[PDB]
Amino acid sequence: QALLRILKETEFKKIKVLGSGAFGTVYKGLWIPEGEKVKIPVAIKELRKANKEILDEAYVMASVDNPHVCRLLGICLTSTVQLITQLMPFGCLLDYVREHKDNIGSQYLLNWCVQIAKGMNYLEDRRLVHRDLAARNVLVKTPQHVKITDFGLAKLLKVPIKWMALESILHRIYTHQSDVWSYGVTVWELMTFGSKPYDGIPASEISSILEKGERLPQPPICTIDVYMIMVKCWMIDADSRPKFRELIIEFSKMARDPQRYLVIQGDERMHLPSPTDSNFYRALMDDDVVDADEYLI
Numbered sequence: 001q002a003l004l005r006i007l008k009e010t011e012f013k014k015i016k017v018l019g020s021g022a023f024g025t026v027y028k029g030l031w032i033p034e035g036e037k038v039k040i041p042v043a044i045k046e047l048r049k050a051n052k053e054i055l056d057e058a059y060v061m062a063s064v065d066n067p068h069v070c071r072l073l074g075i076c077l078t079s080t081v082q083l084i085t086q087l088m089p090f091g092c093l094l095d096y097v098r099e100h101k102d103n104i105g106s107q108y109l110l111n112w113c114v115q116i117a118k119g120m121n122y123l124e125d126r127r128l129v130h131r132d133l134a135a136r137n138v139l140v141k142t143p144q145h146v147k148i149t150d151f152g153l154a155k156l157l158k159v160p161i162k163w164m165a166l167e168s169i170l171h172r173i174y175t176h177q178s179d180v181w182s183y184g185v186t187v188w189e190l191m192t193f194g195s196k197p198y199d200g201i202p203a204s205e206i207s208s209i210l211e212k213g214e215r216l217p218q219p220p221i222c223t224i225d226v227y228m229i230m231v232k233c234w235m236i237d238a239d240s241r242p243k244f245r246e247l248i249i250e251f252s253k254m255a256r257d258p259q260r261y262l263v264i265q266g267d268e269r270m271h272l273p274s275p276t277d278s279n280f281y282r283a284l285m286d287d288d289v290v291d292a293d294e295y296l297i
């Protein structure tokens with residue numbers, strides 16, 4: 001009945017590798033809670049500080065209950081920290097926009113911006129600073145529903161400089177308003193269909209570029225209205241950046257008339273692959289299995 005489930009190593013199995021990261025390696029697997037006689041598709045992140053402290057922070061992660069934020073289902077502490085969460089079968093949003101560029105309309109892009117802002121506003125209510133918001137850390141539950149993950153790992157434990165607010169880079173200051181800067185960069189990644197920010201420019205030169213007033217360029221599909229939101233997220237004065245509550249309102253307004261705000265050739269006729277069409281979905285999910293959501297009822 002624990003909010004943060006403590007799992008035995010026998011209660012889960014890593015089936016295949018999904019990918020690596022600075023923080024750890026993520027696997028596709030199965031959660032088989034002892035005696036409960038059910039198999040639940042999970043991702044398991046094995047990370048590269050006393051136990052009670054790891055548990056304390058993880059509890060806040062298991063506490064999050066919002067449709068736009070991944071929830072930590074369980075933890076296993078051995079020689080390693082392993083985190084267990086519901087498997088998101090469509091992958092991360094960065095890979096998703098790169099792969100489906102020719103079939104992503106304005107409605108989808110703006111709705112994802114709303115969803116991410118709603119999840120971040122929830123984290124702010126939870127007093128949980130993300131520290132690593134980026135398109136790679138937003139997962140696709142369905143094409144019409146994305147969720148934020150990988151929040152607070154940075155605390156629990158190579159810095160992602162090109163997503164960081166200038167005050168984080170210069171003074172290790174991390175707040176919800178530095179998360180707003182990272183939100184700006186994440187939105188830029190979506191609107192460019194997954195371009196790499198400041199491509200070519202060495203990480204060591206980023207703080208000077210920002211101090212000189214240089215910023216990521218206007219994406220070609222963006223009207224000035226949308227680009228101005230991004231630019232406000234990157235103001236030097238953190239208190240002057242939009243708040244997540246204001247971003248929800250603004251992108252929600254835009255999402256009601258999406259073609260006024262994003263200019264996409266053939267916007268009218270775009271359609272995304274279903275579960276049974278998706279290569280990525282099929283790759284992961286290929287028997288007698290129960291969705292975490294259905295189990296968690």
Ligand SMILES: O=C(NCCO)C1=Cc2c(ncnc2Nc2ccc(Oc3cccc4sccc34)c(Cl)c2)NCC1
Pocket residue numbers: 018019020021026042043044045061070071072073083084085086087088089090091092139149150151152153
């Ligand atoms: O390919 C992938 N990533 C590898 C590198 O590319 C994908 C991974 C992928 C996934 N579904 C589900 N979680 C995933 N990752 C992931 C990400 C983070 C995790 O831990 C946390 C850390 C901090 C806060 C919180 S809150 C819930 C979990 C969690 C855990 Cl446990 C898995 N589906 C496929 C996409």
